[PDB]
């Protein structure tokens, strides 16, 4: 079928155009141009265009004709989504206009932006538009419309324009925007919405209690495609509805939208609809091109949003249940289908009810299958908080959930942790040997052949890779060929040994869509593909360095294959619960821990798998300062039917505890049964439910380990803590509490004075000190409040307040190096601790027995409980030693005031951390420390962690005296682990991203190795040099090797110093800091004065590493020397990408001016004229900037430039800019023998450094397509110039009603470089009543034009001419040029002919006839030498005579183009001497053209319209007119009562027009109404537009035909009128007409014949007459020879 592959290949399009676009709300610019209007329907209309984008809405003006020409230029601003934008439709309709009745439609149309933006320079060209109605368009056509339209976003530029004016005119068939193929077709998607369920409760159920807890929400879908919405019924009191219910979405093909939006809505009656959750379907991603058709279910979307919880206060976490964000708890989910129907248009309803036979199909897709989840819970590390215990809910999906009501008790949770102090920064919860295991069961489909593809798949593009990290490793390494080349063939060979997988069968199955077998059939073809090519590739390939491109082709296309939209098993969901409350959550995707029968390539990558995961925050997209927790979770999922392969994935012994409590009292001081306040002797852990010892009994597959007995349950730094507490009333005095020291318990504990060192350990420091590193006051104290019943606060707060009740201080130091069972309480049912105090008379101890699981059932019968409670004990520990190489950072975020930051960073393993030394006032620290966890305890095997090693956390922090200290980022990475000898390699140093928020905030160089630690440690390699005590080096081995190179600073000068402490930067210096070693510039007197440094040239010999990889940041610092000896810092850069800076130092009437010139370099306007054939000069158009060209370098060849930066950041971002440094590197290695002389200097060829000055002539030529700055759409630009502080405003020459305003004027300024090097060229709008309007502005660096080598201070013209018009503008003769870059580039100064015939130049010898070759030379050259110097002047990449195209820029939409400027600027230092004679750019006048035509005759007119003579009769007479010059409307003479349609005139005619012979256009000028302030400029081609009339004596004037002829295409005419036939005028609507004979009036000056004339009925031409007439074009000239007559 055709048009399913048409829709296939949109679709793929629009695929692979949307697969790089982000989600972020970005500004965009959208131009949409009228041009010209051909073959319009009707009779003599008035056609006018409206353009309607996104309710902005813009209209042109009344024309005349159905030929209409607009030239008009509207402009749209909107800010969306870059994959929402897409979802708009731009309308063109055009009306019919009347002058005293209301607007008639007669065309519309249609079209996406997505298309718009799909086409190659993000917008289509010249091209032309299918007119008709909207829902009529059976009828046919009802014209054509040229139009372009543009997309820009941020950084995008619209393309410019060729000479295809002419081929775009007549040759409309051609060039369409659709063509006659696509046609306008009507595209259907029947969404059938089948059920939904586990939807939340969504309402109040205080309604219910009074009058279920489960079916409070009123749900029904909302389905938006293409602006549309579509609601569905509402299910009033149902939690699982099921509406069984089709939407017939409706799109066309020139529009064609792509992401469908289902949004499950909570009806409510009185408040807002309150939303459940909101699913995409992906058009684009359901469809491939043999291709399909758009499909997907029967399939269960899963929803994902706000916690579930209901609460009747506003949530808020509600903008994840709108889609955004990625949503934290399962909000239910919806069956759903989508099917593409074609050519088919469906009725007007909607929504139609699901036929019966498809509810009895969608049955075999909701077959339910038991699944077992398993985890076990290894290490929460990095807690940030200690108060209170914390726990850990699995959930999938509804099944787990704590917080929701259940017929029986679920073992989803952990038990509650209390956190334990680590020894420096963080806290962990203390599970040792004995791990939490949580188990539950859930009930899914067996989507398994779906899970299964995308876990091979997955694993496929895994180890592909691996392979590729391999290669680019061995490549970046520099390795030998042969063992490159034996991993490629590695790679390839695993390539070819995966891609012959068979994807798992589509029968046999129940759950098998339609989707799933298109996608298994695009799968096998793209599986046969990269095996095929891999096959070939391997027969065919050796270089392996240019195979790579095609093997990420291969890793893309593997990612594209393993996306899959129909997967209905949702994900495991963990949460940390604090107290009562949740916290945090992460989820895990449930088909990367599904287990698979058909291996380990199908089940999941952590199917039976440790795997780090780090909590979030419910509405943090990623971690920020706090990581909540770190969690290493093994988590098996699989059928409950396979669960007995379980057990090959279960480490450890799993254990439940029954247990049992007894009770007793205290009378008298003696212990006994007795006297318990309503408890029992025998009791639960209430104490309120008596039970007995044999109520315990092992179920099926357990059974019972030892006896019922009582069972009452490598630190070489460390700091101790103990709290401080406070307590007080409100309002009153702080007095000390009863509990005046506590701790992690929560009671009161040990002195600090009481408390000692254990055995073997020591006091570091003997004082004990409160931590000022918290959210505390100046002494150390925080504050909070309580209620009842909790007394004792769980939150706090950094100030004091009167209200406050309760306050705490913590205190730190550093160290170095009974039997019984009973536990005790002063109340029953309390918290009973270890040994009893003194207020304590009660008392209970624990007793109970273990349970194993018996051998026929495996480690499988945990999940055959289903409160026993499971824990997995592994019965050995495994002793690890970590080595972290921290050697630098760079980049780093400015966290204090003096745009510095003291950084330090701790270092977290497991249960382990460390800090590194604190490093002050840098940005790029080396802390040069190795940083080494002994006696690491991780549990499993060797094997697990070799496989899933534990993650290394670098958490960087700007260290404050007061306060918090700051946040700066944090870098994760694995440690290489080493669990024997045999592969003991070096671990490599890599820059990990010091990501905080959103982005990277720098590179720290570090690497980790985890060595497991054998007996005494001998395998452990040797310690690293120590520096300090208690401070290690970072090894040999590992640091980076340096060598001894130099540092060469070309320090110029200094721009735009801002000031600082309100007073400006007199007296500043350069410092650059880099590896350790700084130089410093000698100290400028006076800024002002000399803005550039005497001295330019710095050299230091810094030892630096010999990677390009291992190189250290180069550190520039501005010190402004100050009175008293103040030298503070104000300014700081850091510059990473040194490789740039890498150098081996060893190394008729053709009257000529300039815009006769400007258009035929244009190669639009007189392209084949006689200018080029004659062979004059030219200049080259760039469409970019000078400074955008590559061929120029961007014109800082001779220095760079890098902005300064002062303060602190804006918190993620760069900080403000506060100057420039200009100037450059060149960075080489030193021969390390001091008997080897140094290499030469780098900077030898300097200018002076003093400021010049200079006259600069800013020639501006046109500007192209502006922003309007007026309600009308227009604009009336001019020119404001500001170069330091001269400013020259041109508002008194303004150009009234432009956005193409030609201003061909020169603004000549002097000026001081570089003090005044900021050339700012701003356009403004004139308003007479109002403020002016910014259209846009540009910024040049005019010393980046004065001291480039390519001499972009003057482009050198084609030849050199000395009088007329391209005369020498430049200073220097060519001669004096030549030399000057010849002494620029070492070449010797070249050598003169005494004839001039010959020049030396580079070493090649050069003469003139070698440029010469046979061109005509006319009288304007001048010196046969100077001709040959510049001749040769433009080979070597020097700046041509220009005209760039600058991009106006505004803080209206910043990165978008507001819109163009054509200009250039000639800098001419006065120390060369004057300019030469300056270019004459001014616009040229048009010339006075009369078009005079005489009607000799008519016949065959048609008859007369119905008049009040009442007769068959004929009136005929002939009107003429030009467009744009309907005041020149004037008739002939009447011929009265003709007979047979014949008519004698012989009426003259004069047609003042005036003209633009080299633009081949008519030019008219003429305000748009009699109050507007200035007259409007109109530039139209020039037609001539001659119809008949018809007089009557008593009724109105009647309209007959028309006839139409560009006077530059002119349709010869016939010799007779019986030879005047139809269709000489192209048809052009209904079928391919035979092409006219052309011919232009202005050459050949006059013609006679006879022309047709015709008029349009129900959409066919008509014959309405014919007419005879001679057609003649004079100037001023002729009519000054021969006289025009009357007329
Ligand atoms: C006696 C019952 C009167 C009930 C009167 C009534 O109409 O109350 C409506 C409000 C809001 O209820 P919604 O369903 O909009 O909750 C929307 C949801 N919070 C969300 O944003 O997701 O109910 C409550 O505040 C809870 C009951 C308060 C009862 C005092
Ligand atoms: C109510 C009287 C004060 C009104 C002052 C005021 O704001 O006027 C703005 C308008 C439109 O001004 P512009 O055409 O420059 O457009 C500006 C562009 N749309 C923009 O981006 O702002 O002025 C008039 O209508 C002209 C008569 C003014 C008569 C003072
Ligand atoms: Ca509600
Ligand atoms: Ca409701
Ligand atoms: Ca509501
Ligand atoms: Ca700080
Ligand atoms: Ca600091
Ligand atoms: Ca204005
Ligand atoms: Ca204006
Ligand atoms: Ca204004
Ligand atoms: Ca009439
Ligand atoms: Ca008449």
Same mark, same amino acid.
């Given at each position: 079928?055709?048009?399913?592959?048409?829709?296939?290949?949109?679709?793929?399009?629009?695929?692979?155009?949307?697969?790089?676009?982000?989600?972020?709300?970005?500004?965009?610019?959208?131009?949409?141009?009228?041009?010209?209007?051909?073959?319009?329907?009707?009779?003599?209309?008035?056609?006018?265009?409206?353009?309607?984008?996104?309710?902005?809405?813009?209209?042109?003006?009344?024309?005349?004709?159905?030929?209409?020409?607009?030239?008009?230029?509207?402009?749209?601003?909107?800010?969306?989504?870059?994959?929402?934008?897409?979802?708009?439709?731009?309308?063109?309709?055009?009306?019919?206009?009347?002058?005293?009745?209301?607007?008639?439609?007669?065309?519309?149309?249609?079209?996406?932006?997505?298309?718009?933006?799909?086409?190659?320079?993000?917008?289509?060209?010249?091209?032309?538009?299918?007119?008709?109605?909207?829902?009529?368009?059976?009828?046919?056509?009802?014209?054509?419309?040229?139009?372009?339209?543009?997309?820009?976003?941020?950084?995008?530029?619209?393309?410019?324009?060729?000479?295809?004016?002419?081929?775009?005119?007549?040759?409309?068939?051609?060039?369409?925007?659709?063509?006659?193929?696509?046609?306008?077709?009507?595209?259907?998607?029947?969404?059938?919405?089948?059920?939904?369920?586990?939807?939340?409760?969504?309402?109040?159920?205080?309604?219910?209690?009074?009058?279920?807890?489960?079916?409070?929400?009123?749900?029904?879908?909302?389905?938006?495609?293409?602006?549309?919405?579509?609601?569905?019924?509402?299910?009033?009191?149902?939690?699982?509805?099921?509406?069984?219910?089709?939407?017939?979405?409706?799109?066309?093909?020139?529009?064609?939208?792509?992401?469908?939006?289902?949004?499950?809505?909570?009806?409510?009656?009185?408040?807002?609809?309150?939303?459940?959750?909101?699913?995409?379907?992906?058009?684009?991603?359901?469809?491939?091109?043999?291709?399909?058709?758009?499909?997907?279910?029967?399939?269960?979307?899963?929803?994902?949003?706000?916690?579930?919880?209901?609460?009747?206060?506003?949530?808020?976490?509600?903008?994840?249940?709108?889609?955004?964000?990625?949503?934290?708890?399962?909000?239910?989910?919806?069956?759903?289908?989508?099917?593409?129907?074609?050519?088919?248009?469906?009725?007007?309803?909607?929504?139609?009810?699901?036929?019966?036979?498809?509810?009895?199909?969608?049955?075999?897709?909701?077959?339910?299958?038991?699944?077992?989840?398993?985890?076990?819970?290894?290490?929460?590390?990095?807690?940030?908080?200690?108060?209170?215990?914390?726990?850990?809910?699995?959930?999938?999906?509804?099944?787990?959930?704590?917080?929701?009501?259940?017929?029986?008790?679920?073992?989803?949770?952990?038990?509650?942790?209390?956190?334990?102090?680590?020894?420096?920064?963080?806290?962990?919860?203390?599970?040792?040997?004995?791990?939490?295991?949580?188990?539950?069961?859930?009930?899914?489909?067996?989507?398994?052949?779906?899970?299964?593809?995308?876990?091979?798949?997955?694993?496929?593009?895994?180890?592909?890779?691996?392979?590729?990290?391999?290669?680019?490793?061995?490549?970046?390494?520099?390795?030998?060929?042969?063992?490159?080349?034996?991993?490629?063939?590695?790679?390839?060979?695993?390539?070819?040994?995966?891609?012959?997988?068979?994807?798992?069968?589509?029968?046999?199955?129940?759950?098998?869509?339609?989707?799933?077998?298109?996608?298994?059939?695009?799968?096998?073809?793209?599986?046969?593909?990269?095996?095929?090519?891999?096959?070939?590739?391997?027969?065919?390939?050796?270089?392996?360095?240019?195979?790579?491109?095609?093997?990420?082709?291969?890793?893309?296309?593997?990612?594209?294959?393993?996306?899959?939209?129909?997967?209905?098993?949702?994900?495991?969901?963990?949460?940390?619960?604090?107290?009562?409350?949740?916290?945090?959550?992460?989820?895990?995707?449930?088909?990367?821990?599904?287990?698979?029968?058909?291996?380990?390539?199908?089940?999941?990558?952590?199917?039976?798998?440790?795997?780090?995961?780090?909590?979030?925050?419910?509405?943090?997209?990623?971690?920020?300062?706090?990581?909540?927790?770190?969690?290493?979770?093994?988590?098996?999922?699989?059928?409950?039917?396979?669960?007995?392969?379980?057990?090959?994935?279960?480490?450890?012994?799993?254990?439940?505890?029954?247990?049992?409590?007894?009770?007793?009292?205290?009378?008298?001081?003696?212990?006994?049964?007795?006297?318990?306040?309503?408890?029992?002797?025998?009791?639960?852990?209430?104490?309120?439910?008596?039970?007995?010892?044999?109520?315990?009994?092992?179920?099926?597959?357990?059974?019972?380990?030892?006896?019922?007995?009582?069972?009452?349950?490598?630190?070489?730094?460390?700091?101790?803590?103990?709290?401080?507490?406070?307590?007080?009333?409100?309002?009153?005095?702080?007095?000390?509490?009863?509990?005046?020291?506590?701790?992690?318990?929560?009671?009161?504990?040990?002195?600090?004075?009481?408390?000692?060192?254990?055995?073997?350990?020591?006091?570091?420091?003997?004082?004990?000190?409160?931590?000022?590193?918290?959210?505390?006051?100046?002494?150390?104290?925080?504050?909070?409040?309580?209620?009842?019943?909790?007394?004792?606060?769980?939150?706090?707060?950094?100030?004091?307040?009167?209200?406050?009740?309760?306050?705490?201080?913590?205190?730190?130091?550093?160290?170095?190096?009974?039997?019984?069972?009973?536990?005790?309480?002063?109340?029953?049912?309390?918290?009973?601790?270890?040994?009893?105090?003194?207020?304590?008379?009660?008392?209970?101890?624990?007793?109970?027995?273990?349970?194993?699981?018996?051998?026929?059932?495996?480690?499988?019968?945990?999940?055959?409980?289903?409160?026993?409670?499971?824990?997995?004990?592994?019965?050995?520990?495994?002793?690890?030693?970590?080595?972290?190489?921290?050697?630098?950072?760079?980049?780093?975020?400015?966290?204090?005031?003096?745009?510095?930051?003291?950084?330090?960073?701790?270092?977290?393993?497991?249960?382990?951390?460390?800090?590194?030394?604190?490093?002050?006032?840098?940005?790029?620290?080396?802390?040069?420390?190795?940083?080494?966890?002994?006696?690491?305890?991780?549990?499993?095997?060797?094997?697990?962690?070799?496989?899933?090693?534990?993650?290394?956390?670098?958490?960087?922090?700007?260290?404050?005296?007061?306060?918090?200290?700051?946040?700066?980022?944090?870098?994760?990475?694995?440690?290489?682990?080493?669990?024997?000898?045999?592969?003991?390699?070096?671990?490599?140093?890599?820059?990990?991203?010091?990501?905080?928020?959103?982005?990277?905030?720098?590179?720290?160089?570090?690497?980790?190795?985890?060595?497991?630690?054998?007996?005494?440690?001998?395998?452990?390699?040797?310690?690293?040099?120590?520096?300090?005590?208690?401070?290690?080096?970072?090894?040999?081995?590992?640091?980076?090797?340096?060598?001894?190179?130099?540092?060469?600073?070309?320090?110029?000068?200094?721009?735009?110093?801002?000031?600082?402490?309100?007073?400006?930067?007199?007296?500043?210096?350069?410092?650059?800091?880099?590896?350790?070693?700084?130089?410093?510039?000698?100290?400028?007197?006076?800024?002002?004065?000399?803005?550039?440094?005497?001295?330019?040239?710095?050299?230091?010999?810094?030892?630096?590493?010999?990677?390009?990889?291992?190189?250290?940041?180069?550190?520039?610092?501005?010190?402004?020397?100050?009175?008293?000896?103040?030298?503070?810092?104000?300014?700081?850069?850091?510059?990473?990408?040194?490789?740039?800076?890498?150098?081996?130092?060893?190394?008729?009437?053709?009257?000529?001016?300039?815009?006769?010139?400007?258009?035929?370099?244009?190669?639009?306007?007189?392209?084949?004229?006689?200018?080029?054939?004659?062979?004059?000069?030219?200049?080259?158009?760039?469409?970019?900037?000078?400074?955008?060209?590559?061929?120029?370098?961007?014109?800082?060849?001779?220095?760079?430039?890098?902005?300064?930066?002062?303060?602190?950041?804006?918190?993620?971002?760069?900080?403000?800019?506060?100057?420039?440094?200009?100037?450059?590197?060149?960075?080489?290695?030193?021969?390390?023998?001091?008997?080897?002389?140094?290499?030469?200097?780098?900077?030898?060829?300097?200018?002076?450094?003093?400021?010049?000055?200079?006259?600069?002539?800013?020639?501006?030529?046109?500007?192209?397509?502006?922003?309007?700055?007026?309600?009308?759409?227009?604009?009336?630009?001019?020119?404001?110039?500001?170069?330091?502080?001269?400013?020259?405003?041109?508002?008194?020459?303004?150009?009234?009603?432009?956005?193409?305003?030609?201003?061909?004027?020169?603004?000549?300024?002097?000026?001081?470089?570089?003090?005044?090097?900021?050339?700012?060229?701003?356009?403004?709008?004139?308003?007479?009543?109002?403020?002016?309007?910014?259209?846009?502005?540009?910024?040049?660096?005019?010393?980046?034009?004065?001291?480039?080598?390519?001499?972009?201070?003057?482009?050198?013209?084609?030849?050199?001419?000395?009088?007329?018009?391209?005369?020498?503008?430049?200073?220097?003769?060519?001669?004096?040029?030549?030399?000057?870059?010849?002494?620029?580039?070492?070449?010797?100064?070249?050598?003169?002919?005494?004839?001039?015939?010959?020049?030396?130049?580079?070493?090649?010898?050069?003469?003139?006839?070698?440029?010469?070759?046979?061109?005509?030379?006319?009288?304007?050259?001048?010196?046969?030498?100077?001709?040959?110097?510049?001749?040769?002047?433009?080979?070597?990449?020097?700046?041509?005579?220009?005209?760039?195209?600058?991009?106006?820029?505004?803080?209206?939409?910043?990165?978008?183009?507001?819109?163009?400027?054509?200009?250039?600027?000639?800098?001419?230092?006065?120390?060369?001497?004057?300019?030469?004679?300056?270019?004459?750019?001014?616009?040229?006048?048009?010339?006075? #053209?009369?078009?005079?035509?005489?009607?000799?005759?008519?016949?065959?007119?048609?008859?007369?319209?119905?008049?009040?003579?009442?007769?068959?009769?004929?009136?005929?007479?002939?009107?003429?007119?030009?467009?744009?010059?309907?005041?020149?409307?004037?008739?002939?003479?009447?011929? #009265?009562?003709?007979?047979?349609?014949?008519?004698?005139?012989?009426?003259?005619?004069?047609?003042?027009?005036?003209?633009?012979?080299?633009?081949?256009?008519?030019?008219?000028?003429?305000?748009?109404?009699?109050?507007?302030?200035?007259?409007?400029?109109?530039?139209?081609?020039?037609?001539?537009?001659?119809?008949?009339?018809?007089?009557?004596?008593?009724?109105?004037?009647?309209?007959?035909?028309?006839?139409?002829?560009?006077?530059?295409?002119?349709?010869?005419?016939?010799?007779?009128?019986?030879?005047?036939?139809?269709?000489?005028?192209?048809?052009?609507?209904?079928?391919?007409?035979?092409?006219?004979?052309?011919?232009?009036?202005?050459?050949?000056?006059?013609?006679?014949?006879?022309?047709?004339?015709?008029?349009?009925?129900?959409?066919?031409?008509?014959?309405?007459?014919?007419?005879?007439?001679?057609?003649?074009?004079?100037?001023?000239?002729?009519?000054?020879?021969?006289?025009?007559?009357?007329?």
């Amino acid at each position: 079928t055709v048009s399913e592959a048409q829709l296939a290949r949109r679709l793929t399009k629009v695929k692979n155009s949307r697969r790089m676009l982000s989600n972020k709300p970005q500004d965009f610019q959208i131009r949409v141009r009228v041009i010209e209007g051909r073959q319009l329907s009707g009779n003599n209309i008035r056609p006018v265009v409206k353009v309607h984008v996104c309710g902005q809405t813009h209209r042109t003006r009344i024309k005349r004709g159905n030929n209409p020409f607009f030239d008009e230029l509207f402009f749209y601003n909107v800010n969306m989504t870059p994959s929402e934008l897409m979802d708009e439709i731009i309308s063109i309709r055009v009306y019919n206009s009347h002058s005293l009745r209301a607007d008639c439609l007669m065309g519309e149309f249609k079209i996406d932006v997505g298309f718009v933006y799909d086409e190659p320079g993000h917008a289509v060209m010249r091209k032309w538009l299918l007119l008709n109605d909207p829902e009529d368009t059976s009828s046919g056509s009802k014209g054509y419309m040229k139009v372009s339209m543009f997309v820009l976003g941020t950084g995008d530029e619209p393309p410019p324009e060729r000479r295809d004016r002419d081929n775009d005119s007549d040759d409309v068939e051609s060039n369409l925007l659709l063509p006659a193929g696509i046609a306008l077709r009507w595209v259907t998607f029947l969404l059938k919405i089948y059920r939904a369920e586990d939807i939340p409760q969504m309402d109040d159920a205080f309604s219910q209690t009074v009058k279920d807890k489960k079916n409070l929400v009123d749900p029904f879908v909302e389905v938006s495609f293409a602006g549309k919405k579509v609601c569905t019924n509402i299910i009033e009191k149902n939690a699982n509805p099921e509406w069984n219910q089709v939407v017939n979405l409706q799109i066309k093909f020139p529009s064609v939208c792509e992401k469908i939006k289902l949004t499950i809505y909570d009806w409510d009656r009185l408040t807002k609809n309150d939303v459940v959750g909101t699913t995409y379907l992906h058009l684009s991603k359901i469809a491939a091109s043999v291709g399909f058709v758009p499909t997907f279910g029967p399939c269960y979307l899963n929803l994902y949003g706000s916690p579930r919880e209901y609460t009747g206060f506003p949530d808020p976490y509600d903008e994840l249940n709108t889609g955004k964000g990625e949503g934290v708890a399962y909000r239910g989910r919806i069956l759903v289908e989508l099917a593409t129907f074609l050519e088919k248009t469906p009725p007007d309803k909607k929504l139609e009810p699901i036929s019966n036979d498809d509810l009895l199909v969608v049955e075999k897709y909701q077959r339910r299958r038991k699944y077992s989840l398993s985890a076990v819970f290894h290490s929460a590390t990095m807690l940030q908080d200690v108060g209170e215990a914390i726990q850990f809910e699995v959930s999938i999906g509804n099944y787990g959930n704590r917080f929701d009501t259940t017929c029986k008790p679920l073992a989803s949770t952990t038990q509650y942790s209390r956190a334990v102090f680590d020894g420096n920064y963080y806290y962990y919860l203390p599970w040792a040997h004995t791990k939490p295991v949580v188990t539950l069961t859930s009930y899914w489909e067996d989507i398994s052949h779906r899970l299964d593809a995308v876990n091979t798949l997955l694993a496929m593009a895994e180890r592909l890779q691996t392979n590729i990290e391999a290669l680019k490793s061995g490549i970046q390494g520099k390795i030998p060929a042969n063992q490159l080349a034996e991993l490629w063939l590695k790679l390839i060979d695993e390539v070819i040994e995966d891609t012959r997988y068979t994807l798992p069968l589509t029968e046999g199955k129940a759950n098998v869509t339609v989707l799933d077998t298109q996608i298994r059939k695009l799968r096998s073809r793209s599986l046969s593909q990269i095996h095929e090519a891999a096959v070939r590739m391997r027969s065919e390939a050796t270089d392996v360095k240019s195979t790579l491109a095609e093997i990420e082709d291969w890793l893309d296309k593997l990612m594209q294959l393993t996306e899959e939209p129909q997967n209905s098993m949702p994900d495991i969901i963990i949460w940390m619960i604090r107290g009562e409350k949740r916290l945090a959550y992460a989820r895990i995707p449930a088909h990367q821990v599904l287990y698979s029968t058909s291996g380990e390539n199908a089940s999941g990558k952590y199917c039976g798998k440790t795997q780090t995961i780090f909590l979030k925050y419910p509405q943090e997209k990623n971690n920020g300062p706090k990581v909540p927790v770190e969690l290493r979770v093994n988590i098996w999922l699989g059928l409950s039917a396979v669960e007995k392969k379980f057990n090959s994935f279960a480490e450890g012994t799993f254990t439940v505890f029954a247990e049992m409590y007894e009770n007793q009292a205290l009378m008298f001081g003696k212990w006994g049964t007795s006297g318990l306040v309503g408890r029992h002797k025998f009791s639960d852990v209430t104490g309120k439910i008596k039970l007995k010892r044999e109520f315990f009994l092992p179920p099926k597959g357990w059974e019972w380990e030892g006896e019922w007995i009582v069972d009452p349950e490598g630190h070489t730094e460390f700091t101790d803590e103990v709290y401080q507490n406070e307590s007080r009333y409100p309002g009153g005095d702080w007095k000390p509490a009863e509990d005046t020291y506590t701790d992690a318990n929560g009671d009161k504990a040990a002195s600090p004075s009481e408390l000692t060192c254990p055995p073997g350990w020591e006091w570091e420091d003997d004082a004990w000190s409160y931590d000022i590193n918290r959210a505390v006051d100046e002494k150390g104290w925080e504050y909070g409040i309580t209620i009842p019943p909790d007394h004792k606060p769980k939150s706090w707060v950094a100030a004091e307040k009167m209200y406050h009740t309760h306050r705490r201080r913590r205190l730190v130091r550093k160290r170095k190096k009974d039997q019984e069972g009973w536990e005790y309480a002063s109340l029953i049912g309390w918290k009973f601790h270890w040994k009893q105090r003194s207020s304590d008379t009660f008392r209970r101890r624990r007793w109970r027995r273990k349970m194993a699981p018996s051998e026929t059932h495996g480690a499988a019968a945990i999940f055959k409980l289903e409160t026993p409670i499971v824990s997995c004990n592994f019965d050995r520990v495994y002793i690890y030693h970590l080595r972290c190489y921290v050697y630098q950072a760079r980049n780093l975020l400015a966290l204090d005031k003096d745009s510095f930051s003291d950084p330090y960073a701790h270092i977290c393993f497991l249960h382990r951390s460390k800090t590194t030394e604190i490093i002050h006032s840098t940005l790029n620290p080396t802390w040069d420390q190795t940083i080494i966890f002994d006696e690491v305890e991780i549990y499993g095997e060797p094997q697990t962690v070799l496989q899933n090693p534990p993650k290394v956390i670098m958490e960087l922090f700007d260290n404050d005296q007061v306060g918090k200290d700051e946040f700066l980022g944090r870098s994760i990475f694995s440690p290489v682990v080493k669990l024997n000898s045999e592969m003991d390699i070096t671990p490599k140093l890599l820059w990990h991203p010091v990501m905080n928020g959103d982005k990277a905030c720098g590179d720290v160089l570090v690497t980790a190795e985890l060595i497991l630690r054998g007996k005494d440690g001998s395998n452990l390699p040797i310690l690293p040099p120590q520096r300090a005590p208690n401070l290690y080096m970072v090894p040999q081995g590992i640091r980076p090797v340096v060598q001894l190179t130099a540092i060469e600073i070309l320090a110029w000068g200094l721009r735009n110093m801002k000031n600082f402490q309100m007073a400006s930067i007199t007296s500043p210096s350069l410092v650059v800091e880099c590896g350790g070693e700084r130089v410093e510039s000698v100290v400028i007197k006076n800024l002002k004065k000399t803005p550039n440094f005497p001295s330019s040239v710095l050299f230091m010999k810094v030892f630096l590493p010999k990677e390009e990889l291992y190189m250290p940041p180069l550190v520039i610092k501005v010190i402004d020397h100050r009175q008293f000896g103040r030298k503070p810092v104000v300014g700081q850069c850091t510059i990473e990408r040194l490789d740039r800076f890498r150098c081996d130092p060893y190394a008729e009437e053709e009257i000529v001016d300039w815009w006769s010139k400007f258009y035929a370099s244009s190669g639009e306007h007189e392209k084949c004229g006689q200018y080029i054939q004659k062979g004059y000069s030219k200049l080259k158009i760039y469409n970019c900037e000078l400074e955008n060209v590559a061929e120029f370098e961007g014109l800082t060849d001779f220095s760079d430039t890098f902005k300064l930066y002062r303060g602190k950041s804006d918190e993620n971002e760069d900080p403000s800019v506060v100057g420039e440094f200009k100037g450059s590197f060149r960075i080489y290695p030193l021969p390390d023998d001091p008997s080897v002389p140094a290499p030469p200097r780098q900077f030898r060829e300097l200018p002076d450094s003093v400021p010049q000055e200079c006259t600069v002539r800013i020639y501006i030529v046109r500007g192209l397509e502006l922003q309007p700055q007026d309600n009308n759409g227009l604009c009336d630009p001019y020119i404001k110039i500001t170069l330091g502080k001269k400013v020259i405003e041109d508002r008194d020459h303004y150009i009234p009603n432009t956005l193409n305003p030609v201003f061909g004027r020169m603004y000549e300024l002097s000026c001081y470089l570089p003090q005044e090097k900021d050339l700012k060229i701003s356009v403004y709008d004139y308003d007479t009543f109002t403020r002016d309007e910014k259209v846009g502005e540009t910024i040049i660096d005019l010393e980046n034009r004065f001291l480039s080598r390519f001499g972009s201070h003057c482009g050198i013209p084609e030849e050199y001419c000395v009088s007329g018009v391209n005369t020498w503008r430049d200073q220097l003769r060519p001669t004096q040029l030549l030399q000057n870059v010849a002494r620029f580039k070492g070449f010797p100064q070249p050598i003169l002919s005494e004839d001039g015939s010959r020049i030396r130049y580079g070493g090649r010898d050069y003469s003139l006839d070698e440029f010469e070759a046979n061109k005509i030379l006319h009288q304007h050259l001048g010196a046969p030498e100077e001709r040959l110097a510049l001749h040769i002047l433009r080979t070597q990449g020097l700046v041509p005579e220009h005209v760039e195209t600058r991009t106006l820029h505004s803080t209206f939409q910043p990165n978008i183009s507001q819109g163009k400027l054509q200009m250039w600027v000639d800098v001419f230092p006065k120390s060369l001497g004057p300019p030469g004679p300056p270019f004459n750019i001014t616009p040229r006048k048009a010339k006075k #053209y009369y078009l005079r035509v005489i009607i000799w005759n008519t016949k065959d007119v048609i008859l007369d319209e119905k008049s009040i003579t009442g007769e068959e009769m004929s009136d005929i007479y002939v009107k003429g007119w030009v467009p744009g010059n309907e005041e020149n409307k004037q008739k002939t003479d009447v011929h #009265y009562r003709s007979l047979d349609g014949e008519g004698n005139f012989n009426w003259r005619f004069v047609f003042p027009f005036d003209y633009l012979p080299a633009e081949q256009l008519c030019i008219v000028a003429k305000k748009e109404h009699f109050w507007s302030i200035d007259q409007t400029e109109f530039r139209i081609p020039p037609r001539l537009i001659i119809q008949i009339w018809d007089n009557d004596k008593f009724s109105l004037d009647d309209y007959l035909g028309f006839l139409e002829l560009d006077l530059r295409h002119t349709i010869i005419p016939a010799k007779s009128p019986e030879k005047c036939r139809l269709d000489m005028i192209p048809d052009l609507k209904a079928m391919n007409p035979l092409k006219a004979k052309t011919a232009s009036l202005f050459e050949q000056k006059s013609m006679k014949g006879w022309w047709p004339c015709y008029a349009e009925k129900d959409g066919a031409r008509v014959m309405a007459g014919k007419v005879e007439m001679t057609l003649e074009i004079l100037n001023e000239k002729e009519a000054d020879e021969r006289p025009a007559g009357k007329g």
